[PDB]
Structure formats: C-alpha cells, structure tokens
C-alpha cells in the first residue's frame, strides 16, 4: 500500500532526500519497490551547488525520503 | 535451552535492547515476532537520553543483543 | 557479463578506493571473482598467486588493454537545520 | 557446519556486525545461531551485561576464549 | 502476530518514526507494509527529539523506506 | 523486473554513471543484469577529478549496488510507457 | 571455475582470510556452506591460536588460497 500511494503522484513533481546531503526535485516518471526511481527535469542540490539533468535514474538504496515540494 | 524462549520469558519484564550501532533501549518487553521486531513500553533511549511514553515498535534488523533486566 | 573478461588481466577498483591488478579466472552472480596473481597497487605488493575476492567489496572491474598497460555523517543534521 | 554443542558451558568469544565484541559462557543456542550467553562482557571500553541473547543474524565470528 | 496487530491498530494515529540516521518524522500514519515501509501525512522532521528544531514540514504524504526505519512509536 | 527491462532498452546508448564515491564515468551501455549490473564500452571521463585511476581501459563492469545515478537523455525514453509500467506494479 | 565450487574442493587446504575489520585468520579449511560461511581448524588469528573458528561469509574481504590449488 505505501508503494501505491506513491503511484498516486506520478508525472507530478516530487522531492527526494538522498544519502549524503543530497536532494533532488524532479517530476516522477517511474519507480519500483526497491525504491530506485526515474525523474525527468531533475535538479540536484549538494551540501550548496546545483546540477541539472533532463532524465536521471536513481538507485534505490540511496533514497531516504520521498515527498512533494 | 533455546534463546527464543528466554526472550519470550522476558515478556512483561525490564529488557535491555542493544543495537549494532552504539545505541540502546530499556523498557518493558510487551511482545516480539520471529524476526525479533520488539515491542517495548515506556522506552528509555540511550546513545544522549530520551524518555518514550507508550508502545514502541523497535525494528528487528538492528537488534544485536537482548538483556533481561538491563 | 564477466565472460569477456575471464582469462584476461584486469584492473579492479575496491569499494574502499583501493586498487588491484589480477587475472580473472572465475566469477559468480554475487560478483565475487576468483583471480590469480593479484597485486595491490596502493601497497605496491604482490598479494597472492591465487585468491577469492568477495563481490561486495568490489565496485568496478576494468579490462586491462593487452596492447597498452597504463595500469602502473553526523554533522549532516546540522546542515538540515542551517537550512 | 559448526557444532555449538562442544562449546556449551565454555567461555566463547563472539564478534558482531557493528564492531562489537562479546565474551561469555555459552548456555544454549539454535540453528539460526541465536546464542544464550552468561557472564557476558561486551566491548565497543568494557561493561558486564548479565545473561544475554545474541542475534545470529548479526553474528560474524565465533571462537573460544 | 503481536507486531502486526500493533500496526493495524495505529494506522490513522500520530506516530514518531525514527530512521537509522537519527532523523525523526512525526505524523499521522497512512499505511504500512511487511517491510516496515511507512507512509505519513503532515509530517514534520526533526533530529533525535520531537522538541528539537524543526528541520522540515511536508504538505503531502511522506514516504520512508522500511530498510531505514529504526522504530515506530506512537504519541 | 521493471528497471531490468527499462535498462535492456538502453543497450547501445551513451549513458553517464555516477557511483557513491562520486566517480563519474561516461560510456556506451553494453549490458545489464537482474541485480542491475552494468558493463560500459568505450569509456570516457566527463570530469577530471571524478574519473578514477584506470589505464587505457575501454570496457568495465560496474556493480549495481555501488551506483547513485545513471544520467540519460529524454530522447532515450518513452516516459509515457514508463508510467503505465509503474502503475502495473505489484508488491 | 565457480568460486563457491573451488572453495568447497579446497577442504583440508591451509588458507588465509582477511575480515572486513582488517583482521587475519589463518588455518585449514574444514567446512564451507553456500553463503561462504567457513569453519577452520589449526587456527591462528592476527590483528592468538585456536582449535576451531567460525566465520560469517559476509564478513570476508578476500581469501588467500594455496598456490598449488589446481
């Protein structure tokens, strides 16, 4: 059921907190139970420099939190 | 004797729960499962100290040692 | 996957950032690989004639070019606050 | 592969996943390698816990002391 | 299963879920699964204590990995 | 097995891979396995400091577990299909 | 050949194991299972002599095997 409430906000913008002072806001395109996620129009904040990609795959074992901004 | 009995016989008694990380909990053992997800009551979390009120589900993954009494 | 590499000298990068040089002579799904004549680059010493190295430690495994051997957490919380 | 039977009532030394040494007398076990230890001493220096149960999931090495 | 029961009994209540990092999230628990995966709503994140400096406030459901959770306590 | 198949669709493509150690390697997606292990051919360094100490190496195996990002080109994915697939999930 | 298969066909052979913490166990292999958990006899342990030792597979970095292992 948690996984299904995530299904709820696909194509919509989400906020991911990663391991190691990392943060990505991008529109959610695809995810799995493992947590690995696919974002489009993403923007990564490191701690503070910025980084932009149009399409990134994220590896699930680094994901701490997902919510929307 | 089995370890999974000693744990059971500590139900409704003071237990110490030490995690692999340098962090422990003392509380009354309320119940547990086959993965050793412990239910603690009025838990005293150490590291540097927090007082919990009620039932806590402590994750069985990080559990390293169980101590009756603590 | 690691079939192209077997029997060929390769450069391996460890998760701890350490580097090795060896010959890949067997591997599993886990990615643990049975290497021969292993040499640690950081220590610059021959580790063994034959070893079994666990998959988890390894990060990456490079096919050494036969024609070109160029081979040789807490404060985090504070941040969130400052923001 | 390890018959804990021969270690019963003996002082054994167990290292645990997390960087935690534990020395005690083996009093009982199971096939998941969950241990009962008495006169347990744990190291990070040192403190003597009483009777303890050790989780075999986090068990990493085991020998005599 | 005692553990399970304590769950279906706290769904819809206010909970503090502490992660391995030390991060604590307080909120009403929308759902939960076999792997301790949690969904929260109107969650607020603090470090270590509920009474410490607010680090973030989420206007939508918060998703926490079960592999990361250390405890789920009520309040 | 979603992300498995997704990645199988990217074979012969230029992808950039970032590890946990911050290492960043550009290269052609040659192969992917279940565990999500990648093997990149004709590899190149996007960043001088991000690149590791590897000789004239062309071809590498990267462990799934040690990856943080794989960077892609919006051209290399039908995001429509990706969302329909994500919906058809099942725990 | 497959690491696991090779390891099991090396029973009786002396070998050197490095654990994650940098420690060095040395002795002869008496048993292996499928998760590369091993028991060893005639054990010496470096940073100490022991009759037998048990090692959890996941706690191993690498295993110096005997040169004459073909």
Swiss-Prot record, chain A:
Q: Name one Pfam family in it.
A: LSM
Record's keyword terms, sorted? Cytoplasm, mRNA processing, mRNA splicing, Nucleus, Ribonucleoprotein, RNA-binding, rRNA processing, Spliceosome, tRNA processing
Q: What Gene3D superfamilies does this protein map onto?
A: 2.30.30.100
Top-level taxon in the UniProt lineage: Eukaryota
Q: Which CDD domains match?
A: LSm3
What GO molecular function terms would the record report?
RNA binding
Q: Where does it localize?
A: Nucleus; Nucleus, Nucleolus; Cytoplasm
Recorded GO cellular component terms are: catalytic step 2 spliceosome; cytoplasm; Lsm1-7-Pat1 complex; nucleolus; nucleus; P-body; precatalytic spliceosome; sno(s)RNA-containing ribonucleoprotein complex
Tell me the Gene Ontology biological-process terms attached to this UniProt entry.
Answer: deadenylation-dependent decapping of nuclear-transcribed mRNA; mRNA splicing, via spliceosome; P-body assembly; rRNA processing; tRNA processing
Q: What InterPro entries does the database record attribute to this sequence? A: Lsm3, LSM_dom_sf, Sm, Sm-like_LSM3, Sm_dom_euk/arc
What happens when you mutate residue 36 to A? Strongly reduces affinity for poly-U RNA ends
Q: What is the effect of changing residue 59 to A?
A: Strongly reduces affinity for poly-U RNA ends
Which residues does the UniProt record annotate as the domain Sm? 1-69
Q: What is the effect of changing residue 19 to E?
A: Sensitive to thermal stress. Decreases binding affinity for U6 snRNA
Function according to Swiss-Prot or TrEMBL: Component of LSm protein complexes, which are involved in RNA processing and may function in a chaperone-like manner. Component of the cytoplasmic LSM1-LSM7 complex which is involved in mRNA degradation by activating the decapping step. Together with PAT1, the LSM1-LSM7 complex binds to osmotic stress-activated mRNAs to attenuate the osmotic stress response, probably by limiting ribosome access to the mRNA and consequently translation. Component of the nuclear LSM2-LSM8 complex, which is involved in spliceosome assembly.
UniProtKB/Swiss-Prot annotation, chain D:
Q: What does the UniProt function comment say about this protein?
A: Component of LSm protein complexes, which are involved in RNA processing and may function in a chaperone-like manner. Component of the cytoplasmic LSM1-LSM7 complex which is involved in mRNA degradation by activating the decapping step. Together with PAT1, the LSM1-LSM7 complex binds to osmotic stress-activated mRNAs to attenuate the osmotic stress response, probably by limiting ribosome access to the mRNA and consequently translation. Component of the nuclear LSM2-LSM8 complex, which is involved in spliceosome assembly.
Quote one Gene Ontology molecular function term.
RNA binding
Name the UniProt record assigns to this protein: LSM complex subunit LSM7
Q: Where in the cell is it found?
A: Nucleus; Nucleus, Nucleolus; Cytoplasm
Got a GO cellular component term for this one? catalytic step 2 spliceosome
Q: What's the family?
A: Belongs to the snRNP Sm proteins family.
Q: Which residues form the Sm domain?
A: 1-65
Q: Where is this protein primarily located?
A: nucleus
What assembly does the database describe for this protein? Component of the heptameric LSM1-LSM7 complex that forms a seven-membered ring structure with a donut shape. The LSm subunits are arranged in the order LSM1, LSM2, LSM3, LSM6, LSM5, LSM7 and LSM4. Except for LSM1, where a C-terminal helix crosses the ring structure to form additional interactions with LSM3 and LSM6, each subunit interacts only with its two neighboring subunits. The LSM1-LSM7 complex interacts with PAT1; within the complex PAT1 has direct interactions with LSM2 and LSM3. The LSM1-LSM7 complex interacts with XRN1.
Swiss-Prot record, chain E:
Keywords assigned by UniProt?
Cytoplasm, mRNA processing, mRNA splicing, Nucleus, Ribonucleoprotein, RNA-binding, rRNA processing, Spliceosome, tRNA processing
Please state the protein's primary subcellular location.
cytoplasm
For this record, an example GO cellular component is: P-body
Task: Write down the species.
Answer: Saccharomyces cerevisiae (strain ATCC 204508 / S288c)
Q: Looking at the Swiss-Prot or TrEMBL record, what is one Pfam family this protein matches? A: LSM
Similarity-based family: Belongs to the snRNP Sm proteins family. SmF/LSm6 subfamily.
Q: Where is the Sm domain?
A: 2-75
- Where does it live in the cell? Cytoplasm; Nucleus, Nucleolus
Q: Which GO terms describe its biological process?
A: deadenylation-dependent decapping of nuclear-transcribed mRNA; maturation of SSU-rRNA; mRNA splicing, via spliceosome; rRNA processing; tRNA processing
- State the name under which the record lists this protein: LSM complex subunit LSM6
Q: Name one GO molecular function term.
A: RNA binding
Q: How does it assemble?
A: Component of the heptameric LSM1-LSM7 complex that forms a seven-membered ring structure with a donut shape. The LSm subunits are arranged in the order LSM1, LSM2, LSM3, LSM6, LSM5, LSM7 and LSM4. Except for LSM1, where a C-terminal helix crosses the ring structure to form additional interactions with LSM3 and LSM6, each subunit interacts only with its two neighboring subunits. The LSM1-LSM7 complex interacts with PAT1; within the complex PAT1 has direct interactions with LSM2 and LSM3. The LSM1-LSM7 complex interacts with XRN1.
Instruction: Please name the taxonomic classification of the source.
Output: Eukaryota, Fungi, Dikarya, Ascomycota, Saccharomycotina
Q: What is the effect of changing residue 65 to A?
A: Reduces affinity for poly-U RNA ends
Superkingdom as given in the UniProt entry: Eukaryota
Task: Give all cystine bridges in this chain.
Answer: none
PROSITE patterns hit by this protein = SM (PS52002)
InterPro entries assigned: Lsm6/sSmF (IPR016487), LSM_dom_sf (IPR010920), Sm (IPR047575), Sm_dom_euk/arc (IPR001163)
Swiss-Prot record, chain G:
- Miscellaneous information on this protein: Present with 3440 molecules/cell in log phase SD medium.
Q: Where is the Sm domain?
A: 2-69
Query: Quaternary structure?
Result: Component of the heptameric LSM1-LSM7 complex that forms a seven-membered ring structure with a donut shape. The LSm subunits are arranged in the order LSM1, LSM2, LSM3, LSM6, LSM5, LSM7 and LSM4. Except for LSM1, where a C-terminal helix crosses the ring structure to form additional interactions with LSM3 and LSM6, each subunit interacts only with its two neighboring subunits. The LSM1-LSM7 complex interacts with PAT1; within the complex PAT1 has direct interactions with LSM2 and LSM3. The LSM1-LSM7 complex interacts with XRN1.
Per the UniProt entry, what species is this protein from, by scientific name?
Answer: Saccharomyces cerevisiae (strain ATCC 204508 / S288c) (Baker's yeast)
Q: What does this protein do, in the record's words?
A: Component of LSm protein complexes, which are involved in RNA processing and may function in a chaperone-like manner. Component of the cytoplasmic LSM1-LSM7 complex which is involved in mRNA degradation by activating the decapping step. Together with PAT1, the LSM1-LSM7 complex binds to osmotic stress-activated mRNAs to attenuate the osmotic stress response, probably by limiting ribosome access to the mRNA and consequently translation. Component of the nuclear LSM2-LSM8 complex, which is involved in spliceosome assembly.
Q: Which family does it belong to?
A: Belongs to the snRNP Sm proteins family.
Compartment(s) of residence: Nucleus; Cytoplasm
